[PDB]
Amino acid sequence: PGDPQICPKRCVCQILSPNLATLCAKKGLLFVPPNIDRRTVELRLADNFVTNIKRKDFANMTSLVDLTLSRNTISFITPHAFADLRNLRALHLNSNRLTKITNDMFSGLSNLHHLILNNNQLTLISSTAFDDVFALEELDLSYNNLETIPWDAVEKMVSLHTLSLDHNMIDNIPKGTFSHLHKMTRLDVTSNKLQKLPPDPLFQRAQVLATSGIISPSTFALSFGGNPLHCNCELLWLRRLSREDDLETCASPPLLTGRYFWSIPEEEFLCEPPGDPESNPAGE
Amino acid sequence: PGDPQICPKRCVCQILSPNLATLCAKKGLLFVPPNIDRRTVELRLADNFVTNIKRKDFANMTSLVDLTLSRNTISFITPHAFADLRNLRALHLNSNRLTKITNDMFSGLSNLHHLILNNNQLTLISSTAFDDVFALEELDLSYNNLETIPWDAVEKMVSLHTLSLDHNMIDNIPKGTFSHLHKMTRLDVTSNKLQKLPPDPLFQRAQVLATSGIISPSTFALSFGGNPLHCNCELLWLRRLSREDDLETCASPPLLTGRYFWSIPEEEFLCEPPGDPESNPAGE
Ligand SMILES: *[C@@H]1O[C@H](CO)[C@@H](O)[C@H](O)[C@H]1NC(C)=O
Ligand SMILES: *[C@@H]1O[C@H](CO)[C@@H](O)[C@H](O)[C@H]1NC(C)=O
Ligand SMILES: [Ca+2]
Ligand SMILES: [Ca+2]
Ligand SMILES: [Ca+2]
Ligand SMILES: [Ca+2]
Ligand SMILES: [Ca+2]
Ligand SMILES: [Ca+2]
Ligand SMILES: [Ca+2]
Ligand SMILES: [Ca+2]
Ligand SMILES: [Cl-]
Ligand SMILES: [Cl-]
Ligand SMILES: [Cl-]
Ligand SMILES: [Cl-]
Ligand code: NA
Ligand code: NA
Ligand code: NA
Ligand code: NA
Ligand code: NA
Ligand code: NA
């Protein structure tokens, strides 16, 4: 309807026509203010103490595009809370207390290009949780407890140019995930449990080359440092890249344990014919 | 013995007589280097990826004073790991993955004046864990999951001048804890579950006073903001202090819900004679 504009007592509401924005940031709120005009395009709740997301909070916000909950203490989100936002392109949940991501949490958002989850305690993400977010251009999981993510849903995100997994428990990356993703310019796996990384043509751009007539800048940013790397032939493709030394370190095999990844010559990365690994490349 | 000095390959060892220091910081280590001279006074491991503390790591370090493990990913500490350090005055565990503090973890350290635990996932601290640390001048629990701490052990720390509890789940502070602690200059309870705060004479110094012939600086730093304050007569002593407005907010009673703590007049903080609280001050 054509009702007059609603603004919470503690917030500031801006109208730059047609758009309307509700800025509540750093007001000390313990919960989402009850009266927020449903026509708000941008909603800034960041740097508050809100602990809970009620179903009624964001209900019926059709034109809502940016929503920033960052730096709140949030342990719970009522199901179907975001179910009413079709137009939301960006959502910032970072620096909260979320321990889990359910299937129904993000289920409604088709138009979302940015999902920022970093600096939470999340130990788990449900299998279908990312099925509807396939339009994401940015996904930040950094600084969490995750040992795995819905890889099958991630390999279906075509336009994603940034994936930040750093500072997690992730022990494995499936081998074919990035094949169909040609927009990815950034992957940060730093401080994880990875013993191995899958080869991808994208990673061929993670090195600097020159003296061909042009000095080629690095067009892909990859950081694998801080992982318990098991150093064998499977990582040789990575050892062949010409890169800065980030102090990456091999966890295994025992003779390579403790030594810098780039300080090891290429000839000393060895796979053992048939238990390292385990018809591997030697053949059997 | 008089053995030659041991230094790890990746570290730098300084001798300023008599003292010896081993600086391993930011070397990318996945574990504590095995050879570290047992006579080291200061050991800097910060900004590494070490995940585990073995019994042998710090064993037999008698003269060790400062030990900084900060900004590591550490989920486990072998029992009796610190049992051999009598002279340790400072220990920095901050920014790690520790989820728990056992009874045997700190059991050995009498001389410890500084314990920095901030930015961990700790949900629990065992009842006797702090019994031996009674000499602590600084204890930083900030940014954790704690709902309670060994208050009985804390009220026995006489020389403690700083306690940082901020950004936790703590729902209650016992009423008599700070009575015997006259050295405390700082308490940060910000972003907790506290509905109430106990009155203490120390908190009488948390306000600024002037026009008596001297403008008195604030000699005690207290931050209670970001708590679900239940606003009744029990907090009146706090409302009487003349302080900056940090945007503290009452969670309850319903008529005070959402309103700024300092925007409420003193006459509107009311306790109800006999269920708020519950022979309370009205008498029964
Ligand atoms: C959402 O919309 C429905 C109908 O469109 C209405 O009944 C309900 O009260 C609305 N809720 C909010 C929080 O606006
Ligand atoms: C610690 O000292 C004991 C005896 O003093 C010795 O047997 C043991 O090997 C030492 N361990 C380390 C790690 O220095
Ligand atoms: Ca964009
Ligand atoms: Ca495929
Ligand atoms: Ca393709
Ligand atoms: Ca690790
Ligand atoms: Ca000191
Ligand atoms: Ca007492
Ligand atoms: Ca006394
Ligand atoms: Ca809170
Ligand atoms: Cl927090
Ligand atoms: Cl974390
Ligand atoms: Cl970490
Ligand atoms: Cl935290
Ligand atoms: Na906050
Ligand atoms: Na946080
Ligand atoms: Na390994
Ligand atoms: Na680190
Ligand atoms: Na951390
Ligand atoms: Na309350």
Author numbering:
A (entry chain A), B (entry chain A): 14 to 287, 312 to 315, 360 to 365
What does the paper say about this structure?
The asymmetric unit of the free SALM5 crystal contained one SALM5 molecule. Except two loops, most residues in the Ig domain of SALM5 were not determined in the free SALM5 crystal due to lack of density, suggesting dynamic movement or multiple conformations of the Ig domain. As demonstrated by crystal packing analysis and structural superimposition, the free and PTPδ-bound SALM5 structures unanimously revealed that two SALM5 molecules form a diad dimer through their LRR domains packing in an antiparallel side-by-side manner. Dimerization of SALM5 is exclusively mediated by its LRR domain. The two protomers in the SALM5 dimer are related by a twofold axis, and the dimer interface buries a total of ~2200 Å2 solvent accessible surface area (SASA) with a long list of residues involved. The LRR domains of two SALM5 molecules constitute a concave platform as the core of the dimer, with approximate dimensions of 56 Å × 68 Å. The SALM5 LRR-Ig totally adopts a totally all-β fold, with the overall structure in an L-shape. The LRR domain resembles a solenoid with its concave side lined with ten long parallel β-strands and convex side comprising variable loops, short β-strands and 310 helical segments. In the site A, two sets of ascending loops in the LRRs 3–6 are intertwined at the dimer interface, and an extensive hydrogen network is built by engagement of residues R110, Q134, and N158. The guanidine group of the residue R110 from one protomer forms four hydrogen bonds with the side chain amide group of N158 and the main chain carbonyl oxygen atoms of N157 and H180 from the other protomer.
SALMs, also known as leucine-rich and fibronectin III domain-containing proteins, are a family of newly characterized SAMs that belong to the type I transmembrane proteins. Members of the SALM family are predominantly expressed in the central nervous system (CNS) and known for their engagement in neurite outgrowth, synapse formation, and synapse maturation. LAR-RPTPs are type I transmembrane proteins and share a common domain architecture of an ectodomain containing up to three immunoglobulin-like (Ig) domains and up to nine fibronectin III (Fn) repeats, followed by a transmembrane domain and tandem intracellular phosphatase domains.
